[PDB]
Amino acid sequence: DGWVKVHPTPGTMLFREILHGQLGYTEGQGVYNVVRSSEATTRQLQAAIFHALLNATTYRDLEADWLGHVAARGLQPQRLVRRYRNAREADIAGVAERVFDTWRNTLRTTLLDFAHGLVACFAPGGPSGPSSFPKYIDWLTCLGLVPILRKRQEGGVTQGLRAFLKQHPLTRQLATVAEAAERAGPGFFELALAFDSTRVADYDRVYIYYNHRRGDWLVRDPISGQRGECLVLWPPLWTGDRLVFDSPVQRLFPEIVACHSLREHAHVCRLRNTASVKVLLGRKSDYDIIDVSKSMDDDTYVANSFQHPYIPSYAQDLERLSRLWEHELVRCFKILCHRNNQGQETSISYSSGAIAAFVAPYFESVLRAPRVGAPITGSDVILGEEELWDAVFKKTRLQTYLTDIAALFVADVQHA
Amino acid sequence: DGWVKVHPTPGTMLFREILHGQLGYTEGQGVYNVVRSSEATTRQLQAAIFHALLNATTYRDLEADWLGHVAARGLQPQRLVRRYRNAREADIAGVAERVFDTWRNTLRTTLLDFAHGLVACFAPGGPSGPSSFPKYIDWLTCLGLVPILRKRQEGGVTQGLRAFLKQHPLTRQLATVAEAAERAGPGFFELALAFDSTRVADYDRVYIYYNHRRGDWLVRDPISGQRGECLVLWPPLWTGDRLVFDSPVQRLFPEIVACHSLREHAHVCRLRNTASVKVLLGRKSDYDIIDVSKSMDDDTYVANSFQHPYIPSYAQDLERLSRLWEHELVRCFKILCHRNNQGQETSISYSSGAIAAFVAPYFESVLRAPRVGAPITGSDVILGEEELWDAVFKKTRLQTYLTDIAALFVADVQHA
């Protein structure tokens, strides 16, 4: 009644089998390994966790902890000045600055350790299990559709967060850390539930239906009988008894088929020229391969015969396909290629817009995550975890408070 | 009832035999030797041990040890100033700074020696024996599955740790070293147990079963009858009476087979042209190789004959295959190639993302290790043991305490 099959047709399995390399392989197709990398999503998760944890800092409690540390050390400005009994301002100012610097560095490394501990719970479950990123990317590359299945339930990520947070000694050790953790807690649990709930379907099991007259999708899972919802990013085109997607493989499909047919024909022609000598026969009027035209003759004669051993060549077509594959995959997914002074492709990573165009829709619709803050740039992908934490730490709120307290302490260390 | 053989099929053994150069060898395939190196895991172990050992340092106890050293030397500020009896601040400050510098240098040397001694117990057992890394890498390269066998037991690593730790003179000599070792001890034992328990199955023994309907794995060891736990990073595809993996060898498989067949056909054609002259015979109407076609002639005649000694060429295919192998292995495993001003491939090592994508899951799942701290950078793989220890020593907790003590001593050496 207007419905039609979409995904499980063989003309769609052919696309995936092409993607696995069942129709030849090229150097250009090897760029696709970078496109599937889960580095961008892990960097985004690390940045989001760091922002959420460091945003809950407060000046009052951190100053209280600093005053408690000063009281523990017994190095108040009154006692220090009454002990030193000298007017050398530079020396005592440097002493106070170093005393503050030690505490600042220890607090920074403690916060780094806690942040890495928090990050460690999410990262492994991203690329594998429920809500897998490379599966999302290959869904996009093959069809442009991403079927998604949802169930509201708890599991590994939530249990991991509950086990990690509820007995970590740093919360008891530092009031500021515990306050920030309890303030930013609910967001972490909501993000964990978002990670757990969704699950992108598998390419060999799911069923997808399309009804042109209204333009809605019905996607079902035949094993469990579970109804899902279909996400569309680059909508297809319906031309009667057909349906043409606009995925990169669909655009690249005819060229590689033609090249494959050319290579097969060249192989067939190659196997023909094994024998060096050939013989031709015919009726009389009244290492070797022998041709017999004796039977078909009747009142005729062999007027003339020719030989021309053609062999098609296919190297130029393979070079063209390699370059075409590379250019298509670079321009479609916004891949930024780093280069040397003259050496080519020293490293490959996502561009600044590629993550905004691909990673952000993942977090926003595929996972339905609560928030991820301001997106990172295309240069923070290259940075390591420690470099990223240092980058976010300097520009965020906490550094301003830390530089604020030091100035006042250096000031009043000698005025009083 | 739906179960299918997966690994012991011949089409899987062919992949490993291809990996061992049974279908020809190329210069590009030689990059795979770097991919199997156990350098990254040893660097990660060294970094983890250094972080664990240095993070347990306590300011109070090392200050007490320094005060004990000062008491032993009899070089307290009171005695030193009362002996020198001069107002030359620069000389006395330099003397005190050198006195502290000798102690800090010898403490650094002692800590380095102890850290190397602790590291020496783990490193040999990594690449070989239980929990071998190159076997894991070639498991990933062949199929993408990593069957793993587990059994909780005590073994050589734990006995080595027990023999090394319980009678080391450094613990009795220094209170700081003993306290840090006692505090960090349980983690070392847990890591040793993690190293002992796991064992990656051998490629020529294990059995792997896959049931598409439900999608779970049953992996068994036929010799001991021990059931294992299967891991998957790059899930395969099921296309009816098949199973298509997405390992690099699977993607590269058709091309190398075509090249091998071309080379074999070229050899066969080459062996044919060894005779310079050829003779063709036929019935009369009413160093040499001679062809007899007179038997099949019957009321016929030889109308025409041809010769064309074809010899296929295969050098271009070999060069293309070498380049394809190299590019595939570079892009799939995220290999960073160092280069000269113009010279190519001065040295080859893991990139910053390669260790996070491959070394980190090994520790997380294959070993089930407790913790490894912050991951290292791809630039730290190049560094040696002493360089890595010095790198982790400067930015860790102990340096702040050591610099704090020096400034306070330099100040109080003359104000009192």
Numbering used by the authors:
A (entry chain a), B (entry chain b): 24 to 27, 29 to 310, 494 to 623
Report text from the authors:
To improve the resolution of the portal baskets, we carried out separate sub-particle reconstructions and refined them while imposing C12 symmetry, leading to portal basket structures at resolutions of 3.6, 3.5, and 3.7 Å for the A-, B-, and C-capsids, respectively. Additionally, an “anchoring” segment of the scaffold protein is resolved interacting with the portal baskets of A- and B-capsids but not D- and C-capsids. The C12 reconstruction of both A- and B-capsid portal baskets revealed a small hook-like density with large aromatic side chains and sharp turns wedged into a hydrophobic pocket between the crown domains of each portal monomer. This density is weaker in A-capsids, but still conspicuous, whereas it is completely absent in C-capsids, D-capsids, and mature virions. Indeed, we found the scaffolding protein residues 449–455 (PYYPGEA, numbered relative to pUL26) to be a good fit for the small density. Based on our model, P452 interacts with the essential residues W127 and L131 (both adjacent to W90) from the first portal monomer, whereas Y451 forms a hydrophobic interface with Y83 and Y608 from the second portal monomer. Furthermore, E454 from the scaffolding appears to stabilize Y608 via hydrogen bonding, buttressing the hydrophobic interactions between the three aromatic residues. Sequence alignment of scaffolding and portal proteins showed that Y608 and Y83 are highly conserved across herpesviruses, suggesting this motif is essential for portal-scaffold association. A- and B-capsids varied in portal height by ~2 and ~1 nm, respectively, could rotate up to 13 degrees relative to the capsid shell, and exhibited up to 1 nm of portal basket “sway,” due to flexibility between the clip and nearby wing and stem domains.
Three capsid types have been recognized from the nuclei of herpesvirus-infected cells: empty A-capsids, scaffolding-containing B-capsids, and DNA-filled C-capsids. Here, portal proteins assemble into a dodecameric basket-like structure that is thought to seed the assembly of scaffolding proteins, in turn driving the formation of spherical procapsids composed of MCP, SCP, and triplexes. A separate protein complex, the terminase, associates with the dodecameric portal and initiates genome packaging and the concurrent autoproteolytic cleavage of the scaffold.
